[PDB]
Structures are given as structure tokens and as C-alpha cells.
Amino acid sequence: GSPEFLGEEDIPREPRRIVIHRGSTGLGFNIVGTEDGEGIFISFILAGGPADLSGELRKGDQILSVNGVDLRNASHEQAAIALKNAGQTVTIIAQYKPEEYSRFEANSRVDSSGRIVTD
């Protein structure tokens, strides 16, 4: 989506519902994870892809569910399968978890507004 929380406005930390209509194309974002159970997170959103256009997602979001399927404790492959096979309309519940995400990316941290910074 377009930028909404500007400057040092805090990024909302409650869960949100995002509905992406992508037909039979990719969603246009990457997911990262480790074990099962530590969370599936958005690491990257492709410029001009369906998530960028049709959705309101950001790097650092945890994917809580896809089309009502709970992914909070999913394995990485099964989360990828769930997303790829979700169909043309994809309803994601996401929640911004930048502290957890920041542990994946080198020299990264969370600033006072909740933004992920990489030095």
C-alpha cells in the first residue's frame, strides 16, 4: 500500500486484515522463518507486485493466518505452500513484529517509532 504512518508516527502493532486479489500470479513478497513455531515474517515486498498494490503489508509483519489457516506456528515450507495455494483471493491476518524480525537481518534494530533500521 501507499505510506500511511509517516515520520515518527508509531507503526500500529495490532493485527490487521489484508485482502489481496492476485488471480493466478505471485503475491509479490518474501517470507522468512526458522524452526516451526518461532514465526513466519515478511522480509521483502516487491515493487509493483500484488502485495504492494492490493495490500497493506510491510517488512517485519508476522503472518498470523492465511484464509483462516493459522500460520503462527507453521513450518517454513508449509507456510509457503499455504500462501502459494491460497487461491486468487488471499486474506492475510498480519501483525507488525519488528523486534523479532530484526534478529534475522545483519546490523538491524528497531528505532523509537518502531521502524526497522539497518546500519
Binding site: G26, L27, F29, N30, I31, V32, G33, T34, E35, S43, H76, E77, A80, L83, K84, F104
Partner: peptide
């Protein structure tokens, strides 16, 4: 470590 990344 045991880290994985995938495009969807």
C-alpha cells in the same frame, strides 16, 4: 541459522 527464505 536454520533460516529459510522463499518468494510467494
Amino acid at each position: 541459522k536454520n533460516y529459510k527464505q522463499t518468494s510467494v
